[PDB]
UniProtKB/Swiss-Prot annotation:
Keywords: Acetylation, Cytoplasm, DNA damage, DNA repair, Host-virus interaction, Metal-binding, Nucleus, Phosphoprotein, Transferase, Ubl conjugation pathway, Zinc, Zinc-finger. The UBR-type zinc finger forms a pocket that mediates recognition of type 1 N-degrons. GO terms for cellular component: chromatin; cytoplasm; cytosol; membrane; nucleoplasm; nucleus; perinuclear region of cytoplasm; protein-containing complex. E3 ubiquitin-protein ligase involved in different protein quality control pathways in the cytoplasm and nucleus. Mainly acts as a ubiquitin chain elongator that extends pre-ubiquitinated substrates. Component of the N-end rule pathway: ubiquitinates proteins bearing specific N-terminal residues that are destabilizing according to the N-end rule, leading to their degradation. Recognizes type-1 N-degrons, containing positively charged amino acids (Arg, Lys and His). Homotetramer; composed of a dimer of dimers. Associates with CDK9 and TFIIS/TCEA1 and forms a transcription regulatory complex made of CDK9, RNAP II, UBR5 and TFIIS/TCEA1 that can stimulate target gene transcription (e.g. gamma fibrinogen/FGG) by recruiting their promoters. Associates with the E3 ligase complex containing DYRK2, EDD/UBR5, DDB1 and DCAF1 proteins (EDVP complex). Binds TOPBP1. Interacts with PIH1D1. Interacts with CIB1. Widely expressed. Most abundant in testis and expressed at high levels in brain, pituitary and kidney. The modification Phosphothreonine is found at residues 610, 630. This is E3 ubiquitin-protein ligase UBR5. The chain holds residues 1 to 1192 of 2799 of the full protein. The modification Phosphoserine is found at residues 283, 439, 559. Belongs to the UBR5 family. GO terms for biological process: cytoplasm protein quality control; cytoplasm protein quality control by the ubiquitin-proteasome system; DNA damage response; DNA repair; DNA repair-dependent chromatin remodeling; heterochromatin boundary formation; negative regulation of smoothened signaling pathway; nuclear protein quality control by the ubiquitin-proteasome system. GO terms for molecular function: RNA binding; ubiquitin binding; ubiquitin protein ligase activity; ubiquitin-ubiquitin ligase activity; zinc ion binding. Zn(2+) 1 binds at residue 674.
Length: 687
């Protein structure tokens, strides 16, 4: 019954703007595609988005795809054809293909442009052109992590296999891996696998490690010693000039502009490590055969070959301060044109294999990823600047981000809300979703709801502003560029496209929009439902469901009773309607015959510290009185459990662990009006 929703975040952007992109989706449900109607009736195990499409996975094992643009989508639901009894268990997203995984551990390919996924006559069992390349044919995989240009699969043999998209196959066997059992993961079993456009992270029971390119600062610091070492002689000596550019014209490289991978070569020498150059961008037809100029920032650009063949020449004649060195390209005229005469002080002796080498950032065996202590790992994801995670030590949850080039949590944050509310009903529901390409991060909750995130002036998690959304089933997202974008405009180059599934809650939503008629009409039907059958399921899921911020049915019925306008409250001596049904629903809920027995555990709870306490703190005083009256009534008849009168009643007014500043009496006196409401813009003498 999950409703699928779309949202677009124009990158580059801030954490704030995402919330406004997650607010109108809540507004739309509180206000009021045809091809996707049949998709809602079945649960979606996983959802991914490619360059111009979006893939879906169903509970039984079927896979489907859809195309969209910027969102407007066509009406074509091309199911994956499975004539044989083939069921799928995992799905990945690639810029070129919709690679899939069947019930058995062999992986398929459904390249976006092509209609039929994969047919091979000579090898009918083969469904991936590299399936025999990584040697996964005789084993089975249970993990899969696919990103814009990357993919990694792992077998029960603790064997991990990596490869890139076919648009980057020109420099395969450097990024990619043939697939063998490491000495990293041999100790603990693999529990999950994550990948991004630059590197892949594997999480173990008490360990995390990664392998791949490590650009940026770690890549940056390679040259301070390397340039110093290079800058710091007889006939027949292999000597080279002490000065040496970082990259000569001819190094191959690749980069991502707006989600479009482009492999390039440079036609000039890299002198400074912060300049930008116009690279050579080759047509895709000639990419696999193994000049335009578009400016490329050297920071993002990664050079994907190793220059171990730096020109070193053999000395043929030493004449005073000058040395005749013939670097790679007896008549004196022919020799002089090729052989170069250089000063002895500018030349340093070179051994065999001692020539300078480009960054060895292509990591195969990692270190510097340490969990603080024996702490359980909730969820882990990978972004453009680190590996996000949410850890836990007893009753202390946190949001630490490991900088892969450092070995320690770069910064530490504590959730402003109570950690016990983050755990929720099911602990494992917590998840962190990142697209990867400097994209924003959204993290889920214990109840499956979205926990809004933003920073404050001191650098910490700002106190959340609840978006009022139901729990989310699937939260796949990805980045795709703006096609047909005129170069003369200021509109952004790329955007992040996020999928959603709000999973629907009948009465939870019927109170969020203060519609009295639906709320009551639901109740006797429930009242007639709980009778004439003596047992069913919807009775006990009444308490189970939870809105944003660990708020139950009673909390939401209070969140709509908050005063909003000072009008009629001046007392100098349809918002107005919407508040009226808010009290009407609240009165109905308390006196309902069927729910009655469950108000004992309903009037005790959210993410900060009880429905009655939220009323006095939210300035809903008539709502607090009605809740207080019901609390007395419930406690009076409770005595049958052989417990005192005061403890049952006190659980619905001020629980034992409530902090001193959250008392209903103290909060009642604290609530006032700010000085601005009687002063104005002028200055007065006040504390």
């Amino acid at each position: 019954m999950t409703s699928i929703h779309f949202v677009v975040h124009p990158l580059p952007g801030t954490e704030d703007q995402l919330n406004d992109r997650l607010r109108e989706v809540s507004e739309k449900l509180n206000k009021y595609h045809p091809p996707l109607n049949v998709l809602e009736q079945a649960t979606i195990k996983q959802c991914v988005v490619g360059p111009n499409h979006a893939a879906f996975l169903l509970e039984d094992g079927r896979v489907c795809r859809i195309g969209f643009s910027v969102v407007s989508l066509g009406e074509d639901l091309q199911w994956w054809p499975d004539k044989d009894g083939t069921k799928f268990i995992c799905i990945g997203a690639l810029y070129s293909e919709l690679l899939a995984v069947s019930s058995k551990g062999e992986l398929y390919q459904w390249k976006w442009s092509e209609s039929e996924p994969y047919r091979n006559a000579q090898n009918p069992s083969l469904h991936h052109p590299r399936a025999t390349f990584l040697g996964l044919t005789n084993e089975k995989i249970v993990l899969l992590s696919a990103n814009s240009i990357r993919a990694t699969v792992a077998t029960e043999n603790n064997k991990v296999a990596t490869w890139v998209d076919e648009t980057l196959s020109s420099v395969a066997s450097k990024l990619e891996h043939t697939a063998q059992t490491y000495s990293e993961l041999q100790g603990e079993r693999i529990v999950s696998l994550h990948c991004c456009a630059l590197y892949t992270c594997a999480q173990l029971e008490n360990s995390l490690y990664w392998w791949g390119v490590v650009p940026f600062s770690q890549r940056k610091k390679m040259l301070e010693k390397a340039r110093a070492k290079n800058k710091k002689i007889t006939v027949g000596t292999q000597v080279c000039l002490r000065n040496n550019p970082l990259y000569h014209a001819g190094a191959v490289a690749f980069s991502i502009s707006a989600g479009i991978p482009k492999v390039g070569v440079l036609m000039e020498s890299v002198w400074n490590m912060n300049d930008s150059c116009r690279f050579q961008l080759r047509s895709p037809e000639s990419l696999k055969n193994m000049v335009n100029e578009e400016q490329w920032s050297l920071r993002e650009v990664v050079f994907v070959e190793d220059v171990k063949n730096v020109p070193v020449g053999k000395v043929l004649k030493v004449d005073g301060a000058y040395v005749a060195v013939k670097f790679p390209g007896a008549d004196p005229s022919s020799l002089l044109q090729d052989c170069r005469l250089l000063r002895i002080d500018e030349l340093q002796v070179v051994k065999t294999g001692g020539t300078p080498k480009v960054p060895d950032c292509f990591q195969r065996t990692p270190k510097k990823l340490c969990i603080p202590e024996k702490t359980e790992i909730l969820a882990v994801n990978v972004d453009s600047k680190g590996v996000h995670a949410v850890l836990k030590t007893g009753n202390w949850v946190r949001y630490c981000i490991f900088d892969l080039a450092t070995g320690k949590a770069e910064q530490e944050n504590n959730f402003p809300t109570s950690s016990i509310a983050f755990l929720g009903q099911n602990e494992r529901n917590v998840a962190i979703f990142t697209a990867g390409q400097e994209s924003p991060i959204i993290l889920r909750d214990g109840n499956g709801t979205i926990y809004p995130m933003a920073k404050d002036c001191m650098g910490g998690i700002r106190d959340p502003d609840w978006l009022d959304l139901p729990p989310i089933s699937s939260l796949g997202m990805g980045v795709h560029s703006l096609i047909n974008l005129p170069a003369n405009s200021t509109i952004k180059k790329k955007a992040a496209v996020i999928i959603m599934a709000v999973e629907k809650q009948t009465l939870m939503q019927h109170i969020l929009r203060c519609d009295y008629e639906a709320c009551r009409q639901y109740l006797m039907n429930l009242e007639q439902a709980v009778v004439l059958e003596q047992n069913l399921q919807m009775l006990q899921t009444f308490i189970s469901h939870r809105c944003d911020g660990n708020r139950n049915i009673l909390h939401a019925c209070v969140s709509v009773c908050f005063p909003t306008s000072n009008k009629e409250t001046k007392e100098e001596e349809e918002s107005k309607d919407r508040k009226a049904n808010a009290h009407f629903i609240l009165k109905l809920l308390c006196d309902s015959v069927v729910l009655q027995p469950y108000l004992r555990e309903l009037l005790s709870a959210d993410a900060r510290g009880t429905p009655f306490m939220s009323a006095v703190s939210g300035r809903a005083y008539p709502a607090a009185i009605t809740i207080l009256e019901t609390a007395q009534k419930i406690a009076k008849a409770e005595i049958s459990s052989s417990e005192k009168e005061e403890d049952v009643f006190m659980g619905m007014v001020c629980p034992s662990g409530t902090n001193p500043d959250d008392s209903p009496l103290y909060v009642l006196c604290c609530n006032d009006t700010c000085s601005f409401t009687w002063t104005g813009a002028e200055h007065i003498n006040q504390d």
